Ligand binder design. Sequence first.
Ligand SMILES: [Cl-]
Length: 413
Amino acid sequence: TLEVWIMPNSPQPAEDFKALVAPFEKAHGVEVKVTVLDAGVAWTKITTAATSGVGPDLTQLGTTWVGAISAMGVLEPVDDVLEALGGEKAYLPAVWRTTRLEGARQATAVPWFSELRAFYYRTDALKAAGVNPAEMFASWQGFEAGLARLKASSFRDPETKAPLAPLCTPGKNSWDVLHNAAPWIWGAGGEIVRQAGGRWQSALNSPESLEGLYFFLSLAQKGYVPAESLEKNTAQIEADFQAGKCAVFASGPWMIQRAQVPEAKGGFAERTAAKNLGVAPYPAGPKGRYTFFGGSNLALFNFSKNKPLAKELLKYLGGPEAQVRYAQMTGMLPALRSAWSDPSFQQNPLLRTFIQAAQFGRTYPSLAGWGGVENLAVQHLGMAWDLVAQGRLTREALKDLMDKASAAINQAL
Ligand SMILES: [Cl-]
């Protein structure tokens, strides 16, 4: 037997994983036990397995968890598994970076699936405002000009009979506050952290990062984002878009599967939003186009009693067949690049657009103390969102907050 710990990734988490690995059990004559760790308790349970030497053979890790657990010295190297799956060239650079602690020699984590963000849009609403998708998602100037025309439009949703908000985004009350901001920081030529003389420090208060953050946050201050959206998390914003209240909003590939499922089974197929759905990658900032990448990897604990067999399951789960099947179950992109060419993606132009958005993929450095950097950053971005909510965000007040964030991050590093 093998023990594997997963987070709730698919609609029926345990049943789904059991169906995924059944062919592996059959061909190797073993049983895979799965335990599903709810999101609230997953980190603490993995941390306790790390410090006590008691736990599974394999655990799922968020991509941003790899540094912290790798640094604890409890993970088995998996360079052999990654070679067997095709090595560095088999993965997007942003994904390959999540296979180790930043700067380490040995890989400690096998890519499993990628979460990435692009913009969904109402094809009917942009048509009715005289906006070409190609123009609005080409550049920052184009994006804001598009929201201006969308705000001025007399378009009504055929079901609500009400106007559409030009843009829906969460503020501070979501799990992805930094992820929402990151494409705007990067695209301005900035970054969250910068390496200097082998040490790491905050770049959040660099002029480039500030031009990025201000461009994004000021959109909600200029009447393109409803007040009520800033109170909500990404899941609730998805629901607003499904209900026909938003012309534009960012999320992952899973929305495409949902647009094909009836409301009665948790989809929105019947809604106008589903029948008039477009997808475009994030617009190009002044210094390039970037797509935020997260998701989950699998690691092998070095106290495991069946490392060789657990590595065969890592090759299985990371490899072409399981990569395709699990991406469909989770509504995510496969981590393995070669799985992108399977007909279940290639037959769906909206999925093909996510594949093209993937080409601009970037993620955060795999730092041991990434959790701390992200929490201090989000805390101060949260205070910036509060000023946006009151129409009182200025370039000067943002800089003051990102200075305080920088002082605290540099101390935690
Ligand atoms: Cl960064």
